[PDB]
Known about the structure:
Elements: H1 2-12, H2 16-30, H3 36-61
The protein binds one DNA strand through residues 11, 14, 54, 58, 62.
Amino acid sequence: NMKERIHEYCHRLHLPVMAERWSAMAEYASTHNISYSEFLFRLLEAEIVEKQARSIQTLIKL
DNA sequence: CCTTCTGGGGAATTTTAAACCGGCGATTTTGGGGAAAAAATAATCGGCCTTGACAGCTGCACAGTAAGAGAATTATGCAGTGCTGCCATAACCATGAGTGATAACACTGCGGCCAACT
């Protein structure tokens, strides 16, 4: 199906965040009118928020 | 007594039969090509007719000559040792040439560090 392959690719790119955020943003856009560009913008926003949180945690760990 | 008729023979001419040679029309024969059929030769198939073997197994004996295996004996080639002489090599200095090295930039290999998944 589509969801399983999406999650596969997301994890292969090291983006379980992508699997999680795509669910939320997809639900929101299906419940709203989000142009594909804005949907992608929200996707990248969530990805980089989680990525920056992880990077800060790793730096503090070091 | 005389006249007319007839017959034989030699020469000239005509016709028909026979034989040869040539010309003309027909069949035959030779050559080549294509197709069909027959026969010859080789290979493959089935089957009948006839008989050998299976019945403990073959190792040994003698004949003569030659080969070979083992042991003893002998010959010879290698090695070992001493003394003397000759040839090679090695040691030094000089000069030339080749290669290992050094500087600089570019590309690649290896080790340290960071992150992602189980």
